[PDB]
Amino acid sequence: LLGGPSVFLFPPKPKDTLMISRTPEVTCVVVDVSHEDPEVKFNWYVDGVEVHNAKTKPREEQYNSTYRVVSVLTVLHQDWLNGKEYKCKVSNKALPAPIEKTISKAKGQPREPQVYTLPPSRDELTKNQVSLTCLVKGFYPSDIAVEWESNGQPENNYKTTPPVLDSDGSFFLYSKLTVDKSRWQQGNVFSCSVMHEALHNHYTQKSLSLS
Amino acid sequence: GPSVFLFPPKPKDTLMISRTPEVTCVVVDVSHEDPEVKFNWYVDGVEVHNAKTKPREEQYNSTYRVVSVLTVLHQDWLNGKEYKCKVSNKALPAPIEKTISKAKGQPREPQVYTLPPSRDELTKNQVSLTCLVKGFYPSDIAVEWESNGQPENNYKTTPPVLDSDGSFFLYSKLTVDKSRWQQGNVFSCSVMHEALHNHYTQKSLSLS
Ligand SMILES: *[C@@H]1O[C@H](CO)[C@@H](O[C@@H]2O[C@H](CO)[C@@H](O[C@@H]3O[C@H](CO[C@H]4O[C@H](CO)[C@@H](O)[C@H](O)[C@@H]4O[C@@H]4O[C@H](CO)[C@@H](O)[C@H](O)[C@H]4NC(C)=O)[C@@H](O)[C@H](O[C@H]4O[C@H](CO)[C@@H](O)[C@H](O)[C@@H]4O[C@@H]4O[C@H](CO)[C@@H](O)[C@H](O)[C@H]4NC(C)=O)[C@@H]3O)[C@H](O)[C@H]2NC(C)=O)[C@H](O)[C@H]1NC(C)=O
Numbered sequence: 001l002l003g004g005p006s007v008f009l010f011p012p013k014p015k016d017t018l019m020i021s022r023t024p025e026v027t028c029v030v031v032d033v034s035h036e037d038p039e040v041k042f043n044w045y046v047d048g049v050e051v052h053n054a055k056t057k058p059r060e061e062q063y064n065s066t067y068r069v070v071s072v073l074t075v076l077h078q079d080w081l082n083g084k085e086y087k088c089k090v091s092n093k094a095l096p097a098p099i100e101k102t103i104s105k106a107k108g109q110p111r112e113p114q115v116y117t118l119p120p121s122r123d124e125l126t127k128n129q130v131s132l133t134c135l136v137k138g139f140y141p142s143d144i145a146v147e148w149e150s151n152g153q154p155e156n157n158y159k160t161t162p163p164v165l166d167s168d169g170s171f172f173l174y175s176k177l178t179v180d181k182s183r184w185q186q187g188n189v190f191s192c193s194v195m196h197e198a199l200h201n202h203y204t205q206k207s208l209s210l211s
Numbered sequence: 212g213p214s215v216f217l218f219p220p221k222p223k224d225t226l227m228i229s230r231t232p233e234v235t236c237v238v239v240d241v242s243h244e245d246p247e248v249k250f251n252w253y254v255d256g257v258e259v260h261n262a263k264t265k266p267r268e269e270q271y272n273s274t275y276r277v278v279s280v281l282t283v284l285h286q287d288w289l290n291g292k293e294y295k296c297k298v299s300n301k302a303l304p305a306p307i308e309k310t311i312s313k314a315k316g317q318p319r320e321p322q323v324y325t326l327p328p329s330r331d332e333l334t335k336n337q338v339s340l341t342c343l344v345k346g347f348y349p350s351d352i353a354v355e356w357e358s359n360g361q362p363e364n365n366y367k368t369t370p371p372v373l374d375s376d377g378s379f380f381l382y383s384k385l386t387v388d389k390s391r392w393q394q395g396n397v398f399s400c401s402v403m404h405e406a407l408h409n410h411y412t413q414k415s416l417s418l419s
């Protein structure tokens with residue numbers, strides 16, 4: 001059947017690179033591997049230097065009669081943050097040439113996010129739920145983790161915008177936590193948690209409660 | 212390719228009768244050799260003719276790029292008509308059909324909340340004025356800022372985000388000089404959406 005494999009290379013999750021105890025991975029995924037010749041070879045390189053510790057998963061047969069193969073390379077936190085490049089080379093006999101993809105952290109000088117919490121608009125207080133907002137602005141690169149909590153337990157009902165390119169070339173985002181107004185008006189404290197490589201200890205919190 | 216990408220009207224254009232909303236059929240990867248593509252255009256299956264195929268354009272990767280733009284009735288698009296592009300060539304065995312329409316479902320009125328700058332932000336030369344727009348459906352929307360019926364230029368708006376009830380929200384951030392905020396200038400966030408009365412509403416923001 002007619003057409004060739006495709007390769008997708010996926011970065012570590014932002015929170016994985018930023019905590020020593022978690023385990024950051026770069027994932028190389030090959031799809032549309034021939035049903036007939038499904039042998040694939042992965043070579044990995046860190047800054048053009050070949051490495052041998054990835055773990056390639058057994059091939060998965062798909063219902064559209066192709067295979068999908070995935071190799072996971074576990075990376076050192078410091079490496080990814082120090083901007084190394086991760087190259088996946090995929091070879092297969094049905095392929096006139098190997099397919100190479102590279103991924104690294106975005107280029108540029110990191111910048112520290114500014115975290116501001118904003119209470120509910122006056123007008124929202126007629127409603128039974130209100131929006132507590134966290135503005136995180138001025139950061140670089142865009143790889144960031146945002147979450148909300150109260151009383152040491154995370155909150156269940158928030159949404160976070162993707163990062164947006166600002167005019168000075170830094171990124172911003174907003175996270176919206178929705179809570180029942182009684183909780184806001186009872187005076188409970190909510191906190192917006194931000195992890196970004198350019199924070200001290202890779203972490204910062206801002207709290208928000210009614211006067 | 213040749214690949215075909217079909218694109219909806221900008222939101223502002225379908226909500227105002229004097230503007231011209233159009234769906235656009237973009238074909239990329241047209242050979243260097245055979246840049247004769249034809250476009251066929253159906254509205255809810257029925258062939259229409261007012262499409263206008265732009266001049267055949269060339270690209271860096273030895274490749275051509277061809278665009279047909281079809282004008283649509285405001286009310287057709289808002290009524291959920293389906294717009295189909297059929298793109299024909301030798302380059303491919305059989306013709307390629309793309310269709311788009313408005314997202315389906317009961318439109319819902321955006322709620323619009325202006326929030327002033329965080330007290331912590333008042334240490335900077337510039338402060339962020341925030342417009343929260345939530346609760347709206349479909350995701351098609353336009354947001355602008357003004358002060359003294361003049362457009363303000365220094366704003367960025369997030370894309371729509373799918374919220375927990377299946378409505379969308381977004382935030383728009385306007386950046387102004389601090390002094391402008393403290394002198395008590397009124398700033399206003401304006402929103403255009405199908406589900407608003409007259410398709411538009413504004414909300415204002417000043418020092419208290
Ligand atoms: C040779 O060089 C050529 C030019 O350099 C190059 O052409 C490029 O080809 C690729 C495909 O290989 C094409 O990529 C797609 O682009 C879509 C976006 O088009 C936008 O955005 C980009 C940049 O931001 C612009 O360059 C585009 O021209 C275009 O501008 C928009 O244009 C419209 C109308 O003209 C305006 O009205 C808009 O204002 C304007 N946008 C703005 C403001 O910037 C993009 O959506 C495509 O994604 C979809 O298709 C992919 C398939 O390849 C899927 O992976 C992906 O998921 C998307 O699929 C869709 O997913 C959506 C999300 O859920 C769904 O809603 C859809 O249903 C779903 N459809 C599916 C399944 O297909 C994709 O990125 C580039 O745009 C094109 N560049 C140009 C100039 O057009 C050639 O590739 C080069 N040849 C090669 C390969 O060697």
Ligand SMILES: *[C@@H]1O[C@H](CO)[C@@H](O[C@@H]2O[C@H](CO)[C@@H](O[C@@H]3O[C@H](CO[C@H]4O[C@H](CO)[C@@H](O)[C@H](O)[C@@H]4O[C@@H]4O[C@H](CO)[C@@H](O)[C@H](O)[C@H]4NC(C)=O)[C@@H](O)[C@H](O[C@H]4O[C@H](CO)[C@@H](O)[C@H](O)[C@@H]4O)[C@@H]3O)[C@H](O)[C@H]2NC(C)=O)[C@H](O)[C@H]1NC(C)=O
Nearest residue numbers: 003006008010011027029031032062063064065066068070
């Ligand atoms: C036979 O069946 C196959 C399986 O159904 C089909 O395979 C599919 O092939 C298409 C390519 O045509 C791939 O499309 C790519 O998807 C990328 C996103 O992949 C993530 O998200 C999807 C759904 O959200 C998910 O199923 C994937 O598993 C993958 O998940 C992530 O996985 C990594 C690694 O495990 C993890 O660390 C991430 O968190 C996790 N994310 C999630 C949400 O789970 C896109 O990135 C790709 O986009 C790039 O390339 C485009 C060009 O194709 C381009 O337009 C974009 O702009 C961008 O650069 C791309 O869209 C599917 O991933 C693949 N699916 C699977 C299951 O692996 C196959 O197509 C079909 N064959 C035929 C002939 O029909």
